[PDB]
Amino acid sequence: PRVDFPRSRLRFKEKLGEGQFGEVHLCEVDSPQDLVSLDFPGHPLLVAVKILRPDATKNARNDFLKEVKIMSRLKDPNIIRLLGVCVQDDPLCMITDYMENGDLNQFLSAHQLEDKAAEGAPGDPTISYPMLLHVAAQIASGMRYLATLNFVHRDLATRNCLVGENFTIKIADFGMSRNLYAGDYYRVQGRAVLPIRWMAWECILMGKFTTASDVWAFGVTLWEVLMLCRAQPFGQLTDEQVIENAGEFFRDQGRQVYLSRPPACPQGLYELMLRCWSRESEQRPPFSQLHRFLAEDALNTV
Numbered sequence: 001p002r003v004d005f006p007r008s009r010l011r012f013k014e015k016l017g018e019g020q021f022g023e024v025h026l027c028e029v030d031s032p033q034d035l036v037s038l039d040f041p042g043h044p045l046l047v048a049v050k051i052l053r054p055d056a057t058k059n060a061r062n063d064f065l066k067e068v069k070i071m072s073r074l075k076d077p078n079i080i081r082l083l084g085v086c087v088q089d090d091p092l093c094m095i096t097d098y099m100e101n102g103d104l105n106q107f108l109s110a111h112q113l114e115d116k117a118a119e120g121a122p123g124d125p126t127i128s129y130p131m132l133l134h135v136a137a138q139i140a141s142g143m144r145y146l147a148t149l150n151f152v153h154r155d156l157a158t159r160n161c162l163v164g165e166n167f168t169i170k171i172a173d174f175g176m177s178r179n180l181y182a183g184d185y186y187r188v189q190g191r192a193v194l195p196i197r198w199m200a201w202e203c204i205l206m207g208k209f210t211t212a213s214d215v216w217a218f219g220v221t222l223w224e225v226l227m228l229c230r231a232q233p234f235g236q237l238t239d240e241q242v243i244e245n246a247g248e249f250f251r252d253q254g255r256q257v258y259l260s261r262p263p264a265c266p267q268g269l270y271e272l273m274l275r276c277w278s279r280e281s282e283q284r285p286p287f288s289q290l291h292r293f294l295a296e297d298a299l300n301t302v
């Protein structure tokens with residue numbers, strides 16, 4: 001915010017990822033204790049530091065400074081936060097918590113649903129159905145916070161969520177240029193890149209994102225979680241078929257198709273997903289209600 005983090009205290013250790021106007025490195029802080037405040041909570045402390053890419057242009061710099069401004073709006077346990085910045089002079093940095101379990105798509109991909117609940121040792125690559133709910137509830141809480149600020153994410157998906165120790169989830173936004181998730185985006189020259197498989201029908205037709213389209217994307221993201229990210233949404237359809245599907249929602253003649261129920265997903269939970277994909281934006285559930293259902297109702301056996 002007002003005072004720059006001491007850049008001299010960072011020791012860079014490895015690359016975590018690379019985006020459109022910046023890249024993220026793991027760093028160590030030699031003495032973490034004397035930097036502590038309310039904005040700044042083995043023996044070395046690890047942080048993740050985003051910096052400008054080496055091919056940095058004036059345009060990338062501008063995008064970096066705006067990113068700092070945008071992220072400064074956001075303070076919530078389940079939204080990524082800036083511990084510190086270096087923007088008074090070069091090189092420019094954004095410092096955040098190191099989330100050691102990486103993005104949620106890669107994390108869930110490496111796990112399997114538990115055969116029998118709580119029968120395994122710590123560390124085994126298994127995850128329980130209640131943990132999936134807990135993961136989902138956290139994303140919903142993060143989205144509830146964003147909705148109160150009238151802040152529209154525009155690209156919610158597991159690939160933009162981070163996983164910390166003890167399964168804390170934080171929503172982030174890594175942009176749309178990563179090689180790893182290129183199949184998730186539909187590109188046309190001179191047009192905005194679009195994650196159509198997560199997009200409400202009205203966005204595909206009008207390109208207008210709202211809190212209600214964020215709810216639709218949360219429905220798809222929840223589907224991802226319950227699939228343990230084993231398949232792409234609408235995976236057996238082409239991009240063009242997925243775009244045509246939005247036209248079918250528009251004409252409203254009952255020919256639109258939906259994501260199928262995941263194996264780990266009970267029918268009651270799947271009805272919630274379907275409500276997120278309601279044709280009319282007003283009928284999609286608010287995040288406060290999505291969170292309530294995921295934190296509580298979903299624990300019912302009746």
Ligand SMILES: O=C(Cc1cccc(C#Cc2cccnc2)c1)Nc1cccc(C(F)(F)F)c1
Nearest residue numbers: 016048050070080094096097098099171172173
């Ligand atoms: O998330 C970003 C980009 C960004 C910036 C600084 C650090 C990191 C990281 C990291 C990392 C990676 C692996 C392990 N641990 C940490 C990511 N921007 C952004 C822009 C607008 C809105 C939002 C939000 F909050 F609404 F989602 C987020």
